[PDB]
Amino acid sequence: MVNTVNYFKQKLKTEQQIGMWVGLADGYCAEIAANVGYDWLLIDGEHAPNDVRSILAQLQSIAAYPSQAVVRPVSGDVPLIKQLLDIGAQTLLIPMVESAEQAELMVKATRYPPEGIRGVGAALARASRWNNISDYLQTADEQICLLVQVESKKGLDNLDEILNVDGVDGIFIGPADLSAALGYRGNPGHEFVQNIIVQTIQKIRAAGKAAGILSADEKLAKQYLELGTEFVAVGVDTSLLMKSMKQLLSKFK
Amino acid sequence: MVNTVNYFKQKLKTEQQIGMWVGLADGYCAEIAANVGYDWLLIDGEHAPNDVRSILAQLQSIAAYPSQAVVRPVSGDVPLIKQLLDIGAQTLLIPMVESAEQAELMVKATRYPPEGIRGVGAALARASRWNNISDYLQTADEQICLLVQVESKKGLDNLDEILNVDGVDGIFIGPADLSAALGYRGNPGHEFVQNIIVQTIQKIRAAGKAAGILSADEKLAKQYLELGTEFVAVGVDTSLLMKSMKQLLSKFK
Amino acid sequence: MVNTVNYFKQKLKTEQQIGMWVGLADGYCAEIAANVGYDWLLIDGEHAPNDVRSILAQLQSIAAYPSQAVVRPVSGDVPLIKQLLDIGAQTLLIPMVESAEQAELMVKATRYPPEGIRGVGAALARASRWNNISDYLQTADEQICLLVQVESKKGLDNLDEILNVDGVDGIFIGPADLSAALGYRGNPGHEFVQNIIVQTIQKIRAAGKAAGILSADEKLAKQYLELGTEFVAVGVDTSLLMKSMKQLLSKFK
Amino acid sequence: MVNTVNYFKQKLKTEQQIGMWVGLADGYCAEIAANVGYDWLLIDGEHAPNDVRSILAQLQSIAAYPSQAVVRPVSGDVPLIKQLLDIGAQTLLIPMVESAEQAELMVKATRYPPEGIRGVGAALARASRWNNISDYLQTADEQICLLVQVESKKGLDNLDEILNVDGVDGIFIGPADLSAALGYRGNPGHEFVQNIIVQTIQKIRAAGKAAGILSADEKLAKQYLELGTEFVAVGVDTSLLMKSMKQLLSKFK
Amino acid sequence: MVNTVNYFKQKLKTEQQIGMWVGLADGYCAEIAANVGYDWLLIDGEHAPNDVRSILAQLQSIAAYPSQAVVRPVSGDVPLIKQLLDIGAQTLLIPMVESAEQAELMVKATRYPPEGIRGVGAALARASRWNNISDYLQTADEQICLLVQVESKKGLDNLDEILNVDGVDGIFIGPADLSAALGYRGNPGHEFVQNIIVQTIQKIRAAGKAAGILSADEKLAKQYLELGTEFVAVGVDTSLLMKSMKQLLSKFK
Amino acid sequence: MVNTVNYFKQKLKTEQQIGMWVGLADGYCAEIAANVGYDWLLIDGEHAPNDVRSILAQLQSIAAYPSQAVVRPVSGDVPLIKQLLDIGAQTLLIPMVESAEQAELMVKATRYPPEGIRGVGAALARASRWNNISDYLQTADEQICLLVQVESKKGLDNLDEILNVDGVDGIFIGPADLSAALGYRGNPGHEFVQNIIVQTIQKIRAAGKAAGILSADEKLAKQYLELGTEFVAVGVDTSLLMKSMKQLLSKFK
Ligand SMILES: O=Cc1ccc(O)cc1
Ligand SMILES: O=Cc1ccc(O)cc1
Ligand SMILES: O=Cc1ccc(O)cc1
Ligand SMILES: O=Cc1ccc(O)cc1
Ligand SMILES: O=Cc1ccc(O)cc1
Ligand SMILES: O=Cc1ccc(O)cc1
Ligand SMILES: [Ca+2]
Ligand SMILES: [Ca+2]
Ligand SMILES: [Zn+2]
Ligand SMILES: [Zn+2]
Ligand SMILES: [Zn+2]
Ligand SMILES: [Zn+2]
Ligand SMILES: [Zn+2]
Ligand SMILES: [Zn+2]
């Protein structure tokens, strides 16, 4: 078997990928999302009740479908990154990255020694399909994609430095965390926040990196796509479930 | 503690209750549905991948909310009915009921000896809150609600006989199973099927029983409500999730 | 490896075994019970929310401890008996047995062909420790113990016939189900019920079978032990947990 | 989406399919087996500790790989067959089939009304991918494969009658159950048993049905393949795990 | 929906709240405890085998009952605090707090930016009921209660400094950890330890903070209540289960 | 009850113990391994998808068998070490230990105050069997065994310093991590790596500590045993399962 090709990673340079957030934290719900045709599915280990084992179940569900899996760990924790790579997550989204030094450590966390610090345990791992991918230890590093979130004042204060880190494939903007950091908690739609987001997207793309963002607002998402933003998540499974059930009830009250 | 009052059962005689089908088979998804404000939630043990333990988890989630839980077992199995009553399901929907003799057996399955055949194990049961409902064995039978599905030719052939069974609180019409039985599989919207459904609702209500049905078609559901149908399910969580995610993607293709 | 010796089965002829009911339905709770020193633990698949997989977990927990495991299935279902024997349950308690013909079928359900109807799948089974017990198919039948419950009027109406069935090792009296059947639901302590229980114990022992019962009433349990009842359950984990937490709170209200 | 094509079913007429028994009862273990390249994987719901939900997890794991999944339910139970079809099992292996009447009922259990009795609940089902397979109710019956086990004297006594049932795609011989039924429990390798198995394979193929069997004996499996047996399972995951770990320890004692 | 009111937090200034430790690590056991009527239930993520997902299940069980849930994470880990707040834990008990600097960080960990560092992910969170609490991001901080444990020499060495931290609602004394730190491991009942505990309770209350403690000793618990201690846990579910089962067996040996 | 004797720890001074790696992450798979007769089983929390709760399940399975359990946490995390000790893991293997200061902290992490920093919560813990081991807090430290991995250049750079730490019972060499660190990723068999491993084994034993290693290569494992290496793992369950299923299929292709 050849290593699973990371089409998400390749498509960062060739197209604009439409994403769905997966916070239902469940192999069965993840399979439903995987049937829709999103370019990418974000398995949220930061803000949904997930652990390594529930994320594994969702990777197994999604694996039968073309949608590419991206996993967000709860934090930039090196041992947790090791665990998520070994269950076979090929793209990671690291929250709250705030310096070039932290971004460099996240690069190393995703690459084998001697160049990186990814723990070596291929025989045991779904990532190597238990060494059924015979040359995994030689071919792994190439299909791993590292995305980092800029979503605080300190992140924006270190944006140019992070954008200079070789091995950061993409910078994703978190409007909820960023709007709160800016003192507009719950109000990312404000011009003050939006002008900072647009400028940030322009700088990311000017430095030759992929830009990404989430917005459930159709108009904002289409604006970000018009700016050339490479990976745009356009909705959240929990939000779509709740809103669809509320809209239906409202027809009958 | 006094036994949990079955408001679903009481409301069969005082109002028209709006229902949501719950097939996501998960305590977390069931809690999301429970926040919307449906009069009743159908935990589907027949067509969703549920067992006694997953149904228990969903009852625990839903219990903090006003929405009344109704459980559909996979079949009219007496021992399975015993298990679902003991985890505390107070309303059951029995699929594919086809005779007065079967309906009478389902009545007995929901009531303690000496009048019924419900196995006695109160001490162990969430139903008695582990005997924290001190008079459970005396007050249980009153808050249990039995609904039976008529959804085959043999069911329609025994409709008058089933409607004469004391202890059947409601007859629910299954348009998917009924349309297939009638040789209109996938096409319940056909006038042939709909005239049989309308006549069936009229007969159920004429015999003094509650009538129920599921339709995701807003126009049909409102027609059934105009006829006086007591319990109408108007949508399905899996369908709402899938359709909402597809409609969103279609805005970006 | 030699087959696990069923010490419960042997001790039916040599001593009076003290039992604890396990309805917490959980490997961790079952292990707590296993540390106490009960002769036998009843893993309740009839009145606690258990399935084959949760019963397996509890058998695995208990297996490190001297306490002997007895499993109650939800009903005398032949395929479910097959499943519980293959996960390695060596003693089964069948509820609501009401005829010699049903007791004979339960005997056959526990024994391999050609003499019985137990499905043969030893290679796959914890029962054979995956053929690590090399002679399992020749030695299995001997360590299997069949107990049947008499707990209805029809059971009492067929008591002499059931007591004549070769392969029934024990008859257990269910006071909750029996008192309800007799029209004393919730009141097994009444003289009418107790005289029937004592007479039933005497008849069981007179026919050379082991007699069993559950009572959380210390005086009744000690009375049953004085009559020579071979297997007496003296409490229930859910009941002891609830009562101990209530008694503690009452000291502080 | 078009309905998933049942390549197992088509290949019953075009080649000899090599199978692996999956009794480890776990999505992660099922995925390991799925990487090997077996034509088919038997998810054992009869002799491994599986339920609908654990079988679902294994179907989800296996679905990303070419290996075709076959599910054995604990018995020919119509409602359980309904559940296993709805989670998306397209091939079923029914144990202990003993008459034309039982085989006909298993045929109906796998087909929608009006011709069959399969319960209609497509909207909710992984089988329809929650109606993402738009014409599922018209195209389902064609990709369902029914296999029945002949593995008792009564099965052999009704072999010609079972072989005349339209809708039975395959007859599988169970050497463990059959050798026990014949009074050679644990000794299927005996000439008495083997001549009956060979004769049975010849009769199955002469009636135009697919023949199947399990043997972990390489010589017996190759003999069955030389006779033209269409679906041959050649090993069991639990057995291969135990034997490989024992053989390794023996090198070091 | 308005944000769930934290009655535990309000009652810290109006009454003395009686608590039960919940270490059975299970939604079903947590529900049993929730029926008793304790003012508060401590879901132990430090010394019972719990993770985010098992703590979620227990919050869901408890949510239907008046008992207020308090969650102890394994350590003062900022990302784990984020996870436990998002599943809807409104009161946290942080173990082994040893400085004003660590207590200040725990305050920030529980509050949204710009004043705190709680990660913003309301849409996804049971805490917001998936934005069904429409103003959650404005009303969340007010219903969050922060308790910190002083249970080491360094904690006692920094007691006055911790008691001056705005945002610490309560200091809880850990007699097991504290007695071990003092070189009286397993002997918290010693006068040396008890005089330090009493002095510590007096200092906590004199600084205007709530004092808390656990003791399964009825006399010690009543002494702590007489001193005015605001939140007193009086027992542990695992201990009450084990002791009740041992005391029962001892009546029969 | 007296504390469980750690026979693994005692046998480090009396014999050479043969080990099996357990990465199938499952109580049922762990029990299969437990039946084989390995001296020790490594429950891998670093490179298999395990958490505290799945490791607990595997400890419960294994506990009925003579095989000694060793648990590898994901990293030398003090709170996670506390959790694994409380579920009753008596031997820990800490990955990627690189200094005397880190080894000393791991020693303290495994011992109660006042000498160590192990959090005290015995009442709640399977480790004390919920205080059924009445003197657990006095007898625990003696049956705890600490192993550390040297598997990086920094580890080898601090080998003499680590070997001087009182309370390190064993140093385990990780050939996958070490060969990668040395720029021979995937090629530990090279003479450059092997000479370093042999020298390292000699230095460990010369300092009076137990030496350990894993090799699935029978010749290398036997060479390590001839050098007197005290704890040698000779295979991995995932590897043996995959290889045995592949070898079987190759006989039939
Ligand atoms: O610990 C990591 C590891 C690496 C390769 C193996 O074969 C087994 C374990
Ligand atoms: O088996 C049912 C049962 C009833 C009451 C109890 O207390 C225990 C068990
Ligand atoms: O189907 C049961 C069975 C029996 C023996 C085996 O080796 C495998 C399966
Ligand atoms: O009960 C089955 C069912 C069928 C179709 C639906 O849309 C919902 C439920
Ligand atoms: O990542 C956090 C998040 C916040 C709000 C959303 O709607 C979705 C995700
Ligand atoms: O927090 C730990 C703890 C210690 C002893 C107990 O009895 C209960 C909890
Ligand atoms: Ca978990
Ligand atoms: Ca289950
Ligand atoms: Zn964010
Ligand atoms: Zn139907
Ligand atoms: Zn009973
Ligand atoms: Zn068979
Ligand atoms: Zn403490
Ligand atoms: Zn390593």
Q: What is the 3-state secondary structure (H, E, C) of chain C?
A: CCCCCCHHHHHCCCCCEEEEEECCCCHHHHHHHHCCCCCEEEEECCCCCCCHHHHHHHHHHHCCCCCEEEEECCCCCHHHHHHHHHCCCCEEEECCCCCHHHHHHHHHHCCCCCCCCCCCCHHHCHHHCCCCCCCHHHHCHHHCEEEEEECCHHHHHCHHHHHCCCCCCEEEECHHHHHHHCCCCCCCCCHHHHHHHHHHHHHHHHCCCEEEEECCCHHHHHHHHHCCCCEEEEEEHHHHHHHHHHHHHHCCC
Stretch (H or E) spanning E225: helix E218-226
One-letter amino acid at F19 equals G
Rounded CA gap, D132 and B9, in Å? 36
Rounded to whole angstroms, the Cα distance separating E225 from E218 reads 10
Residue appearing with tokens 């594919």 = B96
> Three-state SS for B248?
helix
Distance CA B23, CA D188 (A): 45
* F96 φ/ψ sector (left φ>0, alpha ψ -120 to 50, else beta): left
Distance from CA of B214 to the nearest CA of A (A): 14
Find, among B110, A238, B86, the residue nearest to C45 by Cα.
Answer: B86
Q: What are the Cα distances from residue D160, in Å, to D165, D177, D181, F169?
A: 9, 20, 19, 69
Token digits of residue E114:
């710009």
Coil, helix or strand at residue E210: strand
Strand bridging mode B210-214 / A210-214? unpaired
Residue D82 carries which side chain, given as an amino acid letter? K
**Catalytic position from the list B47, B111, B129, B205:** B47
Q: In this structure, are residues C193 and C253 in contact, taking their beta carbons and an 8 Å threshold?
A: no
**CA distances for B139 relative to A150, B3, B112, B142, C185, angstroms:** 59, 7, 11, 6, 12
Residue type at A205?
A: R
Output the six-digit token pair for C155.
Answer: 């059971």
Q: Which 3-state string (H, E, C) describes chain D?
A: CCCCCCHHHHHCCCCCEEEEEECCCCHHHHHHHHCCCCCEEEEECCCCCCCHHHHHHHHHHHCCCCCEEEEECCCCCHHHHHHHHHCCCCEEEECCCCCHHHHHHHHHHCCCCCCCCCCCCHHHCHHHCCCCCCCHHHHCHHHCEEEEEECCHHHHHCHHHHHCCCCCCEEEECHHHHHHHCCCCCCCCCHHHHHHHHHHHHHHHHCCCEEEEECCCHHHHHHHHHCCCCEEEEEEHHHHHHHHHHHHHHCCC
CA D186 to chain centre: 22
Q: Which of D82, D118, D124, D129 to mutate to test the pocket of ligand 4 (most atoms within 8 A of CB)?
A: D124
Largest Cα–Cα separation, chain C = 63
Q: Are E155 and E162 in contact (CB under 8 A)?
A: yes
CA end-to-end distance (rounded Å), chain B = 55
Cβ neighbours of D139 (radius 10 Å): 14
What does the CA dihedral C78, C79, C83, C85 come to, rounded to 10 degrees? 20
Answer for the pair A213, A232: CB distance below 8 angstroms, yes or no.
Answer: yes
Judge contact between D153 and D181, C-beta under 8 A: yes
F72 near F99, Cβ under 8 Å? no
Enter the tokens of residue B130. 């582990």
User: Which residue bears the tokens 């709860």?
Assistant: A74
Which ligand places an atom closest to the C-alpha of E55?
Answer: 7
Show Cβ contacts of residue D239 under 8 Å, excluding neighbours closer than 6 positions. Answer: C123, C130, C131, D21, D216
- Helix axis angle, F52-62 relative to F78-86, nearest 10°? 30
Return phi, psi of residue F94, to 5°: -90, 120
Question: Does the CA dihedral A96-A98-A103-A109 come out positive or negative?
Answer: negative
Bridge partner residues of F43 (DSSP): F22, F71
Q: Is some CB atom of chain B closer than 8 A to the CB atom of D52?
A: yes
DSSP, residue by residue, B189-225: TSHHHHHHHHHHHHHHHHTT-EEEEE-S-HHHHHHHH
Strand-pair partners of F212? F172, F231
Q: Answer whether B60 sits within 8 Å of E132, measured CB to CB.
A: no
Q: What is the DSSP letter of B128?
A: G
Q: Is C214 on the interface with E (CB under 8 A)?
A: no
Distance, CA C64 to ligand 9 centroid (Å)?
47
| Helices D78-86 and D52-62, packing angle to 10 deg | 30
Resolution (A): 2.0
Q: Which residues pair with D146 in a beta bridge?
A: D92
Q: Enumerate neighbours of C (3 or more CB pairs within 8 A).
A: B, D, E, F
Looking from the CA of A79 toward its CB, the CA atoms found within 13 Å total 16
> Is D200:D149 a contact under the CB 8 Å cutoff?
no
Q: Using alpha carbons only, how large is chain B's radius of gyration in Å?
A: 18
The residues pairing with D43 across neighbouring beta strands, listed in sequence order, are D22, D71
Among candidate residues E241, E232, E231, E234, the one with its CA nearest the CA of residue E216: E234
At residue D187, what is the residue type? N
Calculate the alpha carbon distances from A36 to A33, B248, E208 in Å: 6, 10, 56
Neighbours of ion ligand 8 (CB under 5 A): B 51; C 51; D 51
**CB neighbour list of residue C168: distance below 8 Å, 6 or more residues apart:** C103, C106, C107, C146, C147, C148, C162, C209
Which of B56, B78, B138 has its CB closest to that of C186? B138
Chain F residue numbers touching A131 (CB-CB < 8 A)? 239, 242
Please name the residue whose Cα sits nearest to atom 4 of ligand 6. F121
Centre a 10 Å sphere on the Cβ of residue B114 and count the other Cβ atoms it contains: 14
- E173 DSSP 8-state letter: E
- Respond yes or no on whether the N-terminal peptide bond of residue F114 is cis (omega within 30° of 0): yes
| CA F27/CA F30 separation, integer angstroms | 5
How far apart, in whole angstroms, are the C-alpha atoms of residue A160 and residue B250?
A: 36
The overall longest dimension of chain D from CA atoms, in Å, is 63
Provide the CB-side half-sphere exposure for A204 (13 A, CA). Answer: 30
Given a contact cutoff of 8 angstroms between Cβ atoms, the answer to whether B96 and D119 are in contact is yes
- Match 């999604």 to its residue by tokens: A62
Distances in Å between the alpha carbon of B253 and those of A12, A18, B245, F244?
17, 8, 12, 45
The set of catalytic residues of C is: 47
- CA dist F50 to A86, C28, F41, F55, Å? 12, 17, 15, 6
| Residues of E recognised as catalytic | 47
Distance from the D80 Cα atom to the nearest Cα atom in chain C, whole angstroms: 12
- A248 with B238: Cβ contact below 8 A: no
Question: How many Å lie between the alpha carbon of B22 and the closest alpha carbon of chain D?
Answer: 9
Structure tokens at A187: 């109000």
SS3 sequence, A60-122?
Answer: HHHCCCCCEEEEECCCCCHHHHHHHHHCCCCEEEECCCCCHHHHHHHHHHCCCCCCCCCCCCH
Chains that touch A (3 or more CB pairs under 8 A): B, D, E, F
Contact between D183 and D142 (Cβ < 8 Å): no
E-interface mutation test, from A24, A26, A46, most E Cβ less than 10 A away: A46
Both tokens of C82, joined, read: 């097959």
Is the CB of C241 less than 8 angstroms away from the CB of E244? yes
Facing residues of B19 across strands? B40, B233
**Chain C contact probe: residue of D20, D43, D44, D46 with most C CBs at under 10 A:** D46
Q: Are F48 and F131 in contact (CB under 8 A)?
A: no
Find the residue in B nearest to C183 (Cα): B114
Residue B59 in tokens: 């009852």
Per the DSSP assignment, residues forming a β-bridge with A49 are none
Do β-strands E17-22 and E40-44 pair in parallel, antiparallel, or remain unpaired?
A: parallel
Q: Do B238 and D123 touch (CB under 8 A)?
A: yes
- DSSP 8-state symbol, B14: T
Which residue bears the tokens 């397993």? E186
Tokens 């958490």 — which residue?
Answer: F51
Q: How many angstroms separate the CA atoms of E178 and E186, rounded?
A: 10
- Both tokens of F99, joined, read 């200094």
Single-letter amino acid, residue B32 = I
Element (H, E) at B1: none
Q: Does A49 touch chain E (CB under 8 A)?
A: yes
Query: How far apart, in whole angstroms, are the C-alpha atoms of residue F226 and residue F224?
Result: 5
- Count Cα atoms within 13 angstroms, Cβ side, for F53: 19
Nearest CA in chain D to F35: D242
Q: Encode burial over E71-102: b for 16+ CB neighbours within 10 A, e otherwise.
A: bbbbbbbbbbbbbbbbbbbbbbbbbbbbebeb
Q: How far is CA B16 from CA B213, B229, E32, F26, in A?
A: 12, 7, 34, 48
Please tell me the distance from the alpha carbon of residue E77 to that of residue E71, in angstroms, as a whole number.
13
Touching pair A, E by Cβ (3+ pairs < 8 Å): yes
**Residues contacting C118, CB < 8 A, separation 6+:** C81, C82, C85, C108, C109, C110, C111, C112
Q: What are the distances in angstroms from CA B198 to CA B189, B226, B229? A: 12, 11, 10
Cβ–ligand 6 distance for E108 under 6 Å, the answer no
Residue corresponding to tokens 């135009």: D208
How many of the other CB atoms lie within 10 Å of CB of F125? 25
Measured between beta carbons, the chain C residues lying within 8 angstroms of D242 are 130-132
Contact yes or no for C84/C45 (Cβ under 8 A)? yes
Q: Which of residues 20-39 of B touch D (CB under 8 A)?
A: 21, 23, 25
Tell me the C-alpha distance between B46 and B43, whole Å: 9
Strands A17-22 and A231-236 come out as parallel
Q: Which chains touch B (3 or more CB pairs under 8 A)?
A: A, C, D, E
Contact across the interface for B113 and C177, Cβ inside 8 Å: yes
Element (H, E) at A176: helix A175-181
Residue C159, class by beta-carbon neighbours within 10 Å (0-12 exposed, 13-18 middle, 19+ buried)? middle
Q: Give DSSP secondary structure letters for A194-246.
A: HHHHHHHHHHHHHTT-EEEEE-S-HHHHHHHHHTT-SEEEEEEHHHHHHHHHH
Q: Both tokens of residue D231?
A: 């679906």
E160-175 as b/e: b if 16+ CB within 10 A: eebbebebbbbbbbbb
- Residue F25 C-alpha, separation from nearest chain D C-alpha, in angstroms: 9
DSSP structural state of residue E158: T
- Do residues C4 and C88 make contact, with C-beta atoms less than 8 angstroms apart? yes
- Three-class secondary structure assignment of chain F: CCCCCCHHHHHCCCCCEEEEEECCCCHHHHHHHHCCCCCEEEEECCCCCCCHHHHHHHHHHHCCCCCEEEEECCCCCHHHHHHHHHCCCCEEEECCCCCHHHHHHHHHHCCCCCCCCCCCCHHHCHHHCCCCCCCHHHHCHHHCEEEEEECCHHHHHCHHHHHCCCCCCEEEECHHHHHHHCCCCCCCCCHHHHHHHHHHHHHHHHCCCEEEEECCCHHHHHHHHHCCCCEEEEEEHHHHHHHHHHHHHHCCC
Substitution target from F83, F112, F117 for chain E, most E beta carbons within 10 A? F83
Residue D130 Cβ inside 6 Å of ligand 4? The answer reads: no
Give the residue from D152, D201, D11 showing the smallest Cα distance to D91. Answer: D11
Contacts 24+ apart (CB under 8 A), D16-19: D16/D225, D16/D228, D16/D229, D16/D230, D16/D231, D16/D232, D17/D68, D17/D230, D17/D231, D17/D232, D18/D232, D18/D234, D18/F249, D18/F252, D19/D70, D19/D212, D19/D214, D19/D231, D19/D232, D19/D233, D19/D234
**Interhelix angle D27-34/A52-62, nearest 10 degrees:** 40
Tokens of E115: 């004043």
CA distances from F250 to D36, E84, F247 (A): 10, 50, 5
For tokens 């995932």, name the residue. F238
Asked if F4 contacts F218 with a C-beta cutoff of 8 angstroms, the reply is no
Measured CA to CA, the distance from residue D232 to residue C83 in angstroms comes to 24
DSSP A124: G
Residues of B in contact with C172 (CB under 8 A): none
Task: Give F221 Cα–ligand 6 centroid separation in angstroms.
Answer: 44
C236 lines ligand 2 (CB under 6 A): yes
Q: Which runs of consecutive H residues, i.e. helices, occur in chain B?
A: 7-11, 27-34, 52-62, 78-86, 100-109, 136-139, 153-157, 159-163, 175-181, 191-206, 218-226, 237-250
The letter for the amino acid at F87 is I
Four-point Cα dihedral C85, C86, C90, C95, nearest 10:
-20
Give me the half-sphere count of Cα atoms (radius 13 Å) on the Cβ side of residue B63: 30
How far apart, in whole angstroms, are the C-alpha atoms of residue F24 and residue F43? 9
Choosing from D11, D47, D129, D205, the catalytic residue is D47
Look-up of token digits 């070596």 = A120
User: How far apart, in Å, are the Cα atoms of E203 and each of A105, E16, E214?
Assistant: 44, 17, 18
Identify from E238, E249, E250, E253 which residue to disrupt to test chain C contact, counting C C-beta atoms within 10 A and taking the largest count. Answer: E249
Instruction: Name, in order, each residue with C-beta under 8 angstroms of A60's C-beta and a sequence gap of 6 or more.
Output: A27, D27, D31, D57, D60, D61, D64
Q: Is F121 in the pocket of ligand 6 (CB under 6 A)?
A: yes
> Could you tell me if B178 and B215 are in contact, meaning their C-beta atoms sit under 8 angstroms apart?
no
- Total residues found in chain B within this entry: 253
D138, two tokens: 């018209």
User: Who contacts B101 (Cβ-Cβ below 8 Å, separation ≥6)?
Assistant: none
Q: Ligand 5 centroid vs A225 CA: distance in angstroms?
A: 19
Report the candidate in D55, D57, D32 with the shortest Cα–Cα distance to residue D42.
Answer: D55
CA E142 to chain centre: 17
Vertex F233 angle, CA F190 and F180, to 5°: 35
